[PDB]
Design an enzyme around this catalytic site. Structure first.
Site, PDB file in Angstrom:
ATOM      1  N   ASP A  35       0.841  -1.191   0.000  1.00 61.26           N
ATOM      2  CA  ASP A  35       0.000   0.000   0.000  1.00 61.26           C
ATOM      3  C   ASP A  35       0.878   1.245   0.000  1.00 61.26           C
ATOM      4  OD1 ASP A  35      -1.884   1.912   0.296  1.00 61.26           O
ATOM      5  OD2 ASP A  35      -2.402   1.413   2.372  1.00 61.26           O
ATOM      6  N   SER A 199      -0.749  15.680 -11.851  1.00 60.51           N
ATOM      7  CA  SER A 199      -1.019  15.338 -13.237  1.00 60.51           C
ATOM      8  C   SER A 199      -1.277  16.603 -14.038  1.00 60.51           C
ATOM      9  CB  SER A 199      -2.229  14.403 -13.310  1.00 60.51           C
ATOM     10  OG  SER A 199      -2.647  14.166 -14.639  1.00 60.51           O
TER      11      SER A 199
END
Length: 330
Positions: A35, A199
């Site tokens: 994770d 992004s």
């Protein structure tokens, strides 16, 4: 040193991935959920409340000759999905794919929430976010990667998650045969303890690319892609019959639909998530309403590039003094 381990989807939807991890001496192999959105290595154990264990493999520290109680240390964690776990702490030898760390903090669960009990395929979590998020008190502990870093050939790990197929976690090296083209690296902020990046925009299907900054985290422990409501609305508007259902808890769409791809920007590069990766199947067995793999982050507080996005890429988690993330197509 290096390590390399295969990671395998737990079910037909790729809801999560498990990777075998050797703990203790002799080794006890547990299948852990790696994770990159958390920083605790915790396991089902011989200390876990018996009624909360249902098919998981447990770590028994008393059977490991290298286990040592970390005196006074406790841990307690709550995840973004509302699940939680807590317990005490041992140090022990932990190996992943041939890479061994001695003295790793292994957090033994005394209690786990129902969602963990109900998933017999996941024996614990191995956190790969920054060690500043580790929950051990009163002395915070280091992640497996942080402990291994100095010994690795290069201070990196890579995630190559499969679509309906096994994939690979590598430590200490870049497998240049595992991706196509080049890797585009992008800056990371560690201020929140995550692999947080920005992004450069998105496209829906064959549509034009929208240049817009989207801050979010690369999180292998989250199944879906959680993005701003504007972006998610633009995606689902291209699927006839798709709608946001308050009763179901997100966007649903007719199972008879063919989904468009979703592209996200990494610098000037582009990662394309095929439409079929966004189909999470019937909301309940036999239903013709299917659950979408792109959902709004509006109620989370952060955008999350979870498995839906990451499995479309070869992802480099570069843990150099100034961390960065790399993405390549594959």
């Amino acid at each position: 040193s290096t390590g390399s381990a295969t990671t395998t989807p737990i079910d037909s939807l790729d809801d999560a991935y498990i990777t075998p991890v050797q703990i203790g001496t002799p080794a006890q192999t547990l299948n852990l959920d790696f994770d990159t959105g958390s920083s605790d290595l915790w396991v089902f154990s011989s200390e876990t409340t018996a009624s909360e264990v249902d098919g998981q493999t447990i770590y028994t520290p008393s059977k490991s000759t290298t286990a040592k109680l970390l005196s006074g240390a406790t841990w307690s964690i709550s995840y973004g999905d509302g699940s939680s776990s807590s317990g005490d702490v041992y140090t022990d030898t932990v190996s992943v794919g041939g890479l061994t760390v001695t003295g790793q903090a292994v957090e033994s669960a005394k209690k786990v929430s129902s969602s963990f009990t109900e998933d017999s395929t996941i024996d614990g979590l191995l956190g790969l976010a920054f060690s500043t998020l580790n929950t051990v008190s009163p002395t915070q502990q280091k992640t497996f990667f942080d402990n291994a870093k100095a010994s690795l050939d290069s201070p990196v790990f890579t995630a190559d998650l499969g679509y309906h197929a096994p994939g690979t976690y590598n430590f200490g090296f870049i497998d240049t045969t595992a991706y196509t083209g080049s890797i585009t690296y992008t800056a990371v902020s560690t201020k929140q303890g995550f692999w947080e990046w920005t992004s450069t925009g998105y496209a829906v299907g064959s549509g034009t690319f929208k240049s817009t900054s989207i801050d979010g985290i690369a999180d292998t422990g989250t199944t879906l892609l959680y993005l701003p409501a504007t972006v998610v609305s633009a995606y689902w508007a291209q699927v006839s019959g798709a709608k946001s259902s308050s009763s179901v808890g997100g966007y649903v769409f007719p199972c008879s639909a063919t989904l468009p791809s979703f592209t996200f920007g990494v610098g000037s590069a582009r990662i394309v998530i095929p439409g079929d990766y966004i189909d999470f199947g019937p909301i309940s067995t036999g239903s013709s309403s299917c659950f979408g793999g792109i959902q709004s982050s509006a109620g989370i507080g952060i955008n999350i590039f979870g498995d839906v996005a990451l499995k479309a890429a070869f992802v480099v988690f570069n843990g150099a003094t100034t961390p960065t993330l790399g993405f390549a197509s594959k």
